Design an enzyme around this catalytic site. Structure first.
Site, mmCIF file in Angstrom:
data_model
loop_
_atom_site.group_PDB
_atom_site.id
_atom_site.type_symbol
_atom_site.label_atom_id
_atom_site.label_comp_id
_atom_site.label_asym_id
_atom_site.label_seq_id
_atom_site.Cartn_x
_atom_site.Cartn_y
_atom_site.Cartn_z
ATOM 1 N N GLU A 58 0.841 -1.188 0.000
ATOM 2 C CA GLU A 58 0.000 0.000 0.000
ATOM 3 C C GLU A 58 0.881 1.245 0.000
ATOM 4 O O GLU A 58 0.625 2.183 -0.735
ATOM 5 C CB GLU A 58 -0.932 0.020 1.216
ATOM 6 N N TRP A 80 -8.368 -2.555 -0.202
ATOM 7 C CA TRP A 80 -9.117 -1.406 -0.745
ATOM 8 C C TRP A 80 -10.295 -1.737 -1.649
ATOM 9 O O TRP A 80 -10.991 -0.840 -2.112
ATOM 10 C CB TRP A 80 -8.169 -0.431 -1.475
ATOM 11 N N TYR A 94 -4.935 9.502 -1.378
ATOM 12 C CA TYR A 94 -3.550 9.650 -0.933
ATOM 13 C C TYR A 94 -2.481 9.834 -1.982
ATOM 14 O O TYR A 94 -1.791 10.839 -1.997
ATOM 15 C CB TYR A 94 -3.167 8.506 -0.004
ATOM 16 N N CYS A 146 -8.111 9.434 5.959
ATOM 17 C CA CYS A 146 -8.145 9.180 7.396
ATOM 18 C C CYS A 146 -6.839 9.732 7.989
ATOM 19 O O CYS A 146 -6.877 10.548 8.907
ATOM 20 C CB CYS A 146 -8.309 7.688 7.690
ATOM 21 N N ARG A 166 -7.469 12.172 11.386
ATOM 22 C CA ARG A 166 -8.808 12.705 11.696
ATOM 23 C C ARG A 166 -9.852 11.679 12.175
ATOM 24 O O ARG A 166 -10.685 11.983 13.027
ATOM 25 C CB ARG A 166 -9.343 13.587 10.558
ATOM 26 N N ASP A 169 -10.043 3.921 13.047
ATOM 27 C CA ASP A 169 -10.659 2.656 13.409
ATOM 28 C C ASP A 169 -9.547 1.993 14.206
ATOM 29 O O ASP A 169 -8.555 1.549 13.649
ATOM 30 C CB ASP A 169 -10.990 1.856 12.144
HETATM 31 C C1 CB3 Z 1 -5.463 1.510 7.630
HETATM 32 C C2 CB3 Z 1 -5.544 1.068 6.505
HETATM 33 C C3 CB3 Z 1 -5.636 0.508 5.127
HETATM 34 N N1 CB3 Z 1 -6.987 0.041 4.705
HETATM 35 C C4 CB3 Z 1 -7.959 1.107 4.248
HETATM 36 C C5 CB3 Z 1 -9.178 1.162 5.060
HETATM 37 C C6 CB3 Z 1 -10.299 1.447 4.309
HETATM 38 C C7 CB3 Z 1 -11.464 1.527 4.929
HETATM 39 C C8 CB3 Z 1 -11.560 1.317 6.273
HETATM 40 N N2 CB3 Z 1 -12.782 1.376 6.841
HETATM 41 C C9 CB3 Z 1 -12.883 1.169 8.088
HETATM 42 N N3 CB3 Z 1 -14.178 1.211 8.716
HETATM 43 N N4 CB3 Z 1 -11.819 0.896 8.882
HETATM 44 C C10 CB3 Z 1 -10.599 0.833 8.347
HETATM 45 O O1 CB3 Z 1 -9.658 0.577 9.113
HETATM 46 C C11 CB3 Z 1 -10.459 1.034 7.016
HETATM 47 C C12 CB3 Z 1 -9.225 0.962 6.436
HETATM 48 C C13 CB3 Z 1 -7.314 -1.246 5.312
HETATM 49 C C14 CB3 Z 1 -8.422 -1.925 4.944
HETATM 50 C C15 CB3 Z 1 -8.753 -3.192 5.522
HETATM 51 C C16 CB3 Z 1 -7.893 -3.681 6.446
HETATM 52 C C17 CB3 Z 1 -8.327 -5.037 6.975
HETATM 53 O O2 CB3 Z 1 -9.236 -5.709 6.489
HETATM 54 N N5 CB3 Z 1 -7.314 -5.670 7.600
HETATM 55 C C18 CB3 Z 1 -7.625 -7.019 8.003
HETATM 56 C C19 CB3 Z 1 -7.359 -8.009 6.822
HETATM 57 C C20 CB3 Z 1 -5.842 -7.949 6.609
HETATM 58 C C21 CB3 Z 1 -5.589 -8.458 5.149
HETATM 59 O O3 CB3 Z 1 -6.472 -8.780 4.313
HETATM 60 O O4 CB3 Z 1 -4.362 -8.349 4.728
HETATM 61 C C22 CB3 Z 1 -6.790 -7.442 9.212
HETATM 62 O O5 CB3 Z 1 -7.218 -8.346 9.924
HETATM 63 O O6 CB3 Z 1 -5.982 -6.591 9.635
HETATM 64 C C23 CB3 Z 1 -6.747 -3.037 6.854
HETATM 65 C C24 CB3 Z 1 -6.441 -1.768 6.254
HETATM 66 C C1 UMP Z 2 -9.723 5.023 7.369
HETATM 67 C C2 UMP Z 2 -8.655 4.754 6.533
HETATM 68 C C3 UMP Z 2 -7.390 4.557 7.173
HETATM 69 O O1 UMP Z 2 -6.335 4.570 6.556
HETATM 70 N N1 UMP Z 2 -7.528 4.360 8.526
HETATM 71 C C4 UMP Z 2 -8.667 4.327 9.241
HETATM 72 O O2 UMP Z 2 -8.500 4.124 10.441
HETATM 73 N N2 UMP Z 2 -9.896 4.544 8.585
HETATM 74 C C5 UMP Z 2 -11.186 4.543 9.235
HETATM 75 C C6 UMP Z 2 -11.570 5.796 10.034
HETATM 76 C C7 UMP Z 2 -13.098 5.586 10.088
HETATM 77 O O3 UMP Z 2 -13.490 4.542 10.962
HETATM 78 C C8 UMP Z 2 -13.452 5.297 8.609
HETATM 79 C C9 UMP Z 2 -13.692 6.336 7.588
HETATM 80 O O4 UMP Z 2 -14.940 6.894 7.325
HETATM 81 P P1 UMP Z 2 -15.535 8.374 7.471
HETATM 82 O O5 UMP Z 2 -15.273 9.216 6.260
HETATM 83 O O6 UMP Z 2 -14.887 8.940 8.734
HETATM 84 O O7 UMP Z 2 -17.044 8.102 7.605
HETATM 85 O O8 UMP Z 2 -12.322 4.328 8.303
#
Ligand code: CB3
Ligand code: UMP
Ligand code: CB3
Ligand code: UMP
Lengths: 264, 264
Positions: A58, A80, A94, A146, A166, A169
């Site tokens: 990423e 993603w 980003y 985020c 900002r 999660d």
């Molecule tokens: C931050 C960031 C990047 N991203 C972007 C991203 C996009 C939307 C989001 N939406 C929400 N609600 N929370 C997030 O943390 C989030 C993160 C991520 C997305 C998913 C996972 C997640 O599923 N991790 C799992 C599966 C790991 C895997 O498949 O490799 C794990 O158990 O950790 C981690 C990062």
């Molecule tokens: C977003 C992406 C990232 O890299 N890390 C995160 O922790 N998240 C989280 C924050 C929040 O829970 C959500 C985004 O949604 P919104 O625009 O704040 O509704 O994913």
């Protein structure tokens, strides 16, 4: 990590229930800050297994200025998928803002290269900043940034970095975000012949989703292990030339992984 | 305030000597955070008499989307004089970015109106943000924004705000910035019918100028007193309708003012 687990406990102790856009529900606190001394070890969570391959790809992706998942797919990274359109596009997120922030006069600013130049020629500067918060393009993004704004600082030959997130999660995203930035710090430091300093994490809306409660308490019941070590096996000619294989993480021995659902 | 004094001592105790762009030299730290519960009183420093008059007019000046010190002069406020052009212009600073962030396509976004509408229609939003860090206009500014990015947050009918300050003149600038934003939170809450919560201040490069050592030691030797209380006399029809006469500070008994030179 001590700090990370302490953060989870705080949100559980001081959190306030909120209705969130995903209609899932969160337990949240506002305003927090933690520091990781990068010389103590690489801050990759051990109380649960993390996926390093996903974190690295990423980051390389961001650095390339890419905002389409094809690349992530070629490398089997699906983190993603849920937000991409039929074409795999996420909009000007980003990567685009970091590498090509559009001005009103028709120009584009490469913030990464700018920061690199500052670190080498003006490390004392008080404005070594990269921002993904492009107010005028927010609406074209699949999700608003985020990890939105970050600043570098140099002192005693060490590179430190402070990130303002900002929305956070805590269970799912934070571990990823932390590892990613510490990685960027090592790469920047290597490119500038600096040593690594502190990574400072600051959060705005820091929350735990309602459907992560059991996973959180499960994790909290574990003792962190010794932090792993990051080894970079080469010095590319530019921060844009790193490869997945230039990195090696040693001594990572985490507890078992914990699966949890992500809110869309 | 105890928090303010504590930060002051931390800089003397742990600060690193830096050669800044002004050539004055600073004692610097990186990354710090402090929280002010607005319910406990207005956070106007008491160990040194502050001038609420210049603080109010600057804020009102910002809310009007103004970048010309003319208006400030109309009111005997001279704080921005050193940086204005022969015409009194500073460039697209705070005011312009708050009220009319220009999109790459020629439009403008009003962040204050946006934030107002968010607090009113979607208070749980995790993105109630205002950014003055417009990468595409920095070089047009007389001075890059110090208070660069802020976020609002609502929980249990209370309005909190977090500010990210990338550069901070601890002795001269800080007391001003803290009151300014506290003030803003009070107006937003009133226009949005909310209670005031916490004001969280986060700094990047936080420093004390070399020629502020004497004043610092003087201040550090005074005992803080109870914080005043802020009073708003009339509820204007809109956040852009306040006037100097609308605010009254009550119970402010500060130690005598301390004179210090500005580093330009
Ligand atoms: C931050 C960031 C990047 N991203 C972007 C991203 C996009 C939307 C989001 N939406 C929400 N609600 N929370 C997030 O943390 C989030 C993160 C991520 C997305 C998913 C996972 C997640 O599923 N991790 C799992 C599966 C790991 C895997 O498949 O490799 C794990 O158990 O950790 C981690 C990062
Ligand atoms: C977003 C992406 C990232 O890299 N890390 C995160 O922790 N998240 C989280 C924050 C929040 O829970 C959500 C985004 O949604 P919104 O625009 O704040 O509704 O994913
Ligand atoms: C932050 C900010 C806004 N501004 C903008 C501003 C611009 C450049 C700066 N540059 C530096 N090095 N420090 C600052 O605090 C600073 C502040 C200010 C400008 C100066 C004063 C200063 O003169 N304070 C006097 C006020 C006395 C009076 O009211 O006339 C004091 O002694 O307290 C305060 C704020
Ligand atoms: O509202 C303000 C404006 C400026 N400063 C300080 C930060 C630095 O000391 C200096 C500006 O220098 P640059 O970082 O913009 O170069 O003024 C503040 O504390 N508050």
């Amino acid at each position: 990590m001590k700090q990370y687990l302490e953060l989870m406990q705080k949100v559980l102790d001081e959190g306030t229930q909120k209705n969130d856009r995903t209609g899932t529900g969160t337990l949240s606190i506002f305003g927090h800050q933690m520091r990781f001394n990068l010389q103590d070890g690489f801050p990759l969570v051990t109380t649960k297994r993390c996926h390093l391959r996903s974190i690295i790809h990423e980051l390389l992706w961001f650095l390339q200025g890419d905002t389409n998942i094809a690349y992530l797919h070629e490398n089997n990274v699906t983190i993603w998928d849920e937000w991409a359109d039929e074409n795999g596009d996420l909009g000007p997120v980003y990567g685009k803002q970091w590498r090509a922030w559009p001005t009103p006069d028709g120009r584009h600013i490469d913030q990464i290269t700018t920061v690199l130049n500052q670190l080498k020629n003006d490390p004392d500067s008080e404005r070594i900043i990269v921002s993904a918060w492009n107010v005028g393009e927010l609406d074209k993004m699949a999700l608003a940034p985020c990890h939105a704004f970050f600043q570098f600082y140099v002192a005693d030959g060490k590179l430190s970095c402070q990130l303002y997130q900002r929305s956070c999660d805590v269970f799912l995203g934070l571990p990823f975000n932390i590892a990613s930035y510490a990685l960027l710090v090592h790469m920047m430091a290597q490119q500038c012949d600096l040593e690594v300093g502190d990574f400072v994490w600051t959060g705005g809306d820091t929350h735990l989703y309602s459907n992560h409660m059991d996973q959180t308490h499960l994790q909290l019941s574990r003792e962190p292990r010794p932090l792993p070590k990051l080894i970079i096996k080469r010095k590319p000619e530019s921060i844009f030339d790193y490869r997945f294989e230039d990195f090696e993480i040693e001594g990572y021995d985490p507890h078992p992984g914990i699966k949890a659902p992500v809110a869309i």
